[PDB]
Amino acid sequence: IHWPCRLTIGSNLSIRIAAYKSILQERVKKTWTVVDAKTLKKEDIQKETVYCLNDDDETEVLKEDIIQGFRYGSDIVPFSKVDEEQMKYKSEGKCFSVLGFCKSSQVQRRFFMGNQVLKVFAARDDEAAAVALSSLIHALDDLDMVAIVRYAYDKRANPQVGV
C-alpha cells in the first residue's frame, strides 16, 4: 500500500513520495492450526499462560502486580509498561529524510544491511517534480551518489537509517 511521505532535507527539499516493497516473501496465510488428534477441534483447545510466581505453590498473579525488569549490569532494573512507555521516543510519522551524500564506491555489496529492496516511487501529484527526481536519479548514478536517509517506518515504528 501507499507509504506517503515528503522527502525533506535542508530548508528547500520536500518531495512527496509513496514507498512500496519490491522484495517481500509471501508467507503461508492459513497456519498449521493445532487440533486435538481425537476430535480435530482447536475450539476445544485452550492456551493459557498461568502467570505463576516463584512460590512452592507458585501463586499465579496477573501482570496487575507484575513489572518488566531488565538485567542492568550486575542487577535488574524493573520498568513498568508506562515506565518504559514514557522513556521512549521515536520519529513520529512516516518519516523519510536523507542525511547527505557520498559515493556508493565507499560502500560495498558486502557492506549492506536490511532485508529487502524498497523501490521508493517518484514525486506524488507532481510530474514535473517526478521527472526532476528522475534527473536527480541520473545525477546520483553519475557521481555514485547515495541518498543516506533517516527513515521512520511509520508513526508506529522507530527511525531506521537507510539509503
Add this chain to the structure above:
Amino acid sequence: YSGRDSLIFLVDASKAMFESQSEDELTPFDMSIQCIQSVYISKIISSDRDLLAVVFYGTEKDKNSVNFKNIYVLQELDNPGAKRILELDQFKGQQGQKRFQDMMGHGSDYSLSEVLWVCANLFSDVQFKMSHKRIMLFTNEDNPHGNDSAKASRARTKAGDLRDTGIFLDLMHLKKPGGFDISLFYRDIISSKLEDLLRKVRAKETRKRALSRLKLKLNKDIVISVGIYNLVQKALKPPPIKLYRETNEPVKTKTRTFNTSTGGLLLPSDTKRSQIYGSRQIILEKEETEELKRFDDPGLMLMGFKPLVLLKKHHYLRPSLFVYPEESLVIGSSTLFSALLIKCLEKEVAALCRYTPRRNIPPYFVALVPQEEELDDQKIQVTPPGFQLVFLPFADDKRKMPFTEKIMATPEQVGKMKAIVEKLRFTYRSDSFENPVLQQHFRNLEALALDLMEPEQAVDLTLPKVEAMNKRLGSLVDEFKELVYPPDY
C-alpha cells in the same frame, strides 16, 4: 575465545588525586572519579563479561582484606553493576572527595610494593576464563621514584613478575600530558584517552566465541570445513524479565496447551497440526511438520558459478553472512581457498549453492561474495578472507510495482544537481549511525538506574538538519528546481 577482561582501577589517595601538579584544575580526585564512573557505565551498557576492582594506592587507615598498610580496597574484582555505581557516587564530585576525607582522608601514606601484592592477590582471586587483566592508574606523581630505593626496586621486580604473569598496567597522563614528559621515570616499567573514557561509548556487543561452523559439501565427494558468522546484527529490546510489580519477584508464566472444554492439559501427541483449506482440513503433526521442513543435512552443496556481474541492487535480500575457511576435518581448505583468492581476479564468477542452515530445516540458495585477505596497513583484517553470504531470492521474494515508466529530464537538471550533491557531499563515515531510540533507551536505563534527574536524549549523527546542508550548499537546490509548483507544495 571466551574470557573475562579483569580491569583494576588504581587511583592515588595522598595528592595525585588532589594536587594540580603542573596544571590548574581542581583536585584530580573528582575528574578521575567521573572518568572511572563513565567507563563503568560504558561497560554496563556494552560489556558485562569483564571484572572490575578499584584500589587506592596510598591509605592513611587501611580498608583492605589484605590488611596491609597503605591499602584501601573499595570494590573487589566483579562485573560492572549498580552497587559499584552507588559505591563510587559516594566518592563522586567534591562531596565525594570530602567523604574520602571523612572516612580515610587524603594525604594518605602509600605502600607501592604492597599495592602490587594485593592487586596480585585480587588477580589470583578470579576463578573464571580470563581474557585480559589490566591495571588502570592515574597519578599526578608521574615519577615518585623519590621513595626509598628498596621500594622502587621491589615494585619494579613485582612489575616484571606481573607482566611476566601477564598482568598489565596502565598509567596515563595526569600531570604533564603529552611530549612523553609524564612518567618522568616510571616509564621504566610502563610502555590522551581521558576524552574517550569520559565519553563512555557503550552498547557494543560483539562475538566472543566461535559458532555456526559447517562444511562445503560442494559435490557428492568433496566437503570443506568452514564457519558462518555475523557482524551485522539487529539490535534487540533488552529482555522484559516479568518482576512482581511490588516485590520485584520474577514470574512463572505457566503457559501450556489445554482444552477449553474438559479441563485437561493437552500434549503435542494427542493433538495434531492442521490446515483449514477449502473443503479439507489438511492435518499434520509436529514431526510431520519437521519432515515437511526436513530437506537435507546442513552444509554448502555447490550449485554452480556465477560472475559478480549479474548481482544488482534488486538482487538483494537479508544482510549477508560470512564464511571463513576452516580446517578441522578437511585438510587444504585454507590452502585451496588461498588459491581461490589469488585467482579471484578471475574468480569474479563466485560459488553458487543452496545453503542448508541446519538439519530439519530446508536449504536456501545464497550467493557467496569472495572476501579477500583485505588486511589494512595498520593490520586490520577488514572483510577477512572468506565469502559473504548474499542470499539468492526466489519468486517468493517479490512484491511487484506498477509500471508507470518515467522518462528522463533535460541534462541541465542532472548536471546542476550533480554539482549540488557533490558540493553537498556528506563526509563519509561508516561508524556514524546510532539509533536515537536505542541511545535514548540506554540513557533511560542508566539514568533510571540511579536517581538521575533526567536521561539525556542523545542527539545522533543520524538526525538530518535544515541549515547545515543549507549552508554547505544553500537554497540553490530550490532555485535550480525551476519547474512551476515544485514538490514544495
Add this chain to the structure above:
Amino acid sequence: CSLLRLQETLSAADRCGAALAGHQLIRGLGQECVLSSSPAVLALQTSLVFSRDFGLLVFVRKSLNSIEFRECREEILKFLCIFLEKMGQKIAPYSVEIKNTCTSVYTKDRAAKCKIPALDLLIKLLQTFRSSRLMDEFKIGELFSKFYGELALKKKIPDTVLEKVYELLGLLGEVHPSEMINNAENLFRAFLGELKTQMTSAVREPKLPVLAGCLKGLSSLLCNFTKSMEEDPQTSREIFNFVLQIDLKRYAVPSAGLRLFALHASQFSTCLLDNYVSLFE
C-alpha cells in the same frame, strides 16, 4: 559434639551471600557425609535427629538460588540419597516429614532450575517407597495428584539429562486407586506417542538420556497390572522392542528397554505367535 558443632557453625557460617562460606558449608557437608559413612548405632540415633533438625534448617533457611545454596544443597540431597541405602524403617514418622520436604523441594527450583538435586529428590523418594509402602504412603495420593497435574504439563523446557519421560520414575507405592488408573491411561497414550517418536531410529533424533530416562520406568511400575493383552497397543509395545541399530557406550539404554521387556514378559501374550525365530535369535 562434632554433629552439634557442624549443626551450629554450619547453621552459623551461612550468613548472607558468601558463596565461599556456602561452599565451606558444602565442605562441612562432606565431613558429615563421611561421618555417616563411619556410623555407630548411638551415632545412628544421634545423626537421625541431627538429620531432622539441620536438614530442615538447610531445607528452609537457605531456600534461595544463591550458588552456595545451589551446590551445598545439591550435595546435601546427594548425601541424603547415598545414605538412604541404610536406615531401616526407623525413617517412618520421619519418612512423611522428608516426603513433604522433598515434594516442596520439587516445587522449588527443582521445578524451575532442576538439577542434580531433582534427581536426588526422585531417587530418594522412590527408593523410600520401595523400602516402605503404605504406612504413610497416602499423602502420596494427593502428592501424585499434583504430580500428574504437573506431569500432564506440556512444558518440556527442563534439562535433557533432567527429563522425566522414559525409564525410571515408577509410581505404584499407593493402592493404585482409580485416581492413578485414570491418570495412568493418559500416561500410557503419551508413552505410546512419544515412543513412536523415539523409534524413528533413522532420523538422528536419539533423545535417549534421562528423556528416555524416567517415565516409562513409571510405566514399568505401572504396566505390571494395566492394559492386558487385549488390543493393538499390546502388539505396539511388543514391537517397541525391535531396535532394543547399534549403540555402544555400554549400550545402557537399549539394554534398559530390553530389561523392561524382561520385566513384563508376562505382559507379552496373545500376539508373540508371530516371528518365533527373529525374537528368539
Add this chain to the structure above:
Amino acid sequence: RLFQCLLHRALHPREPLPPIQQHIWNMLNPPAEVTTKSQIPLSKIKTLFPLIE
C-alpha cells in the same frame, strides 16, 4: 513440497506422506553436463588434496 503434501493429505490423508518430491527436488540439482566436464578436473583437485584430519 507443501502443495504436494496438501494433495496427498487431501486425496489420501490415510496414507504415509511421500518424500519432499523427486521432480521438484529434481529441478534444483546442479548442471549435469558441468559435472561431466568437471569430474576429470574435479578428480584432479580432489585427489590432489586429501580433505580429512
Add this chain to the structure above:
DNA sequence: GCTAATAAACTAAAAACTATTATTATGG
C-alpha cells in the same frame, strides 16, 4: 456510505560456549 493486508512487535527459539561421568577397555 465498510471495514485491513499489515509489519511498531511478536514473545521466541535448538545455537556447543562447555564438558563429568561413564566409559567397560585394564591394575584390585
Add this chain to the structure above:
DNA sequence: CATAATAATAGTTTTTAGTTTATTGGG
C-alpha cells in the same frame, strides 16, 4: 569378577532463526 579404566553425551548462553502484536482498508 576381577577394580582409580578415561571417551562422548551432555550440562552451557548462545543470536538467531517464526512468533500476532499491530492500521489502511470494498461498501
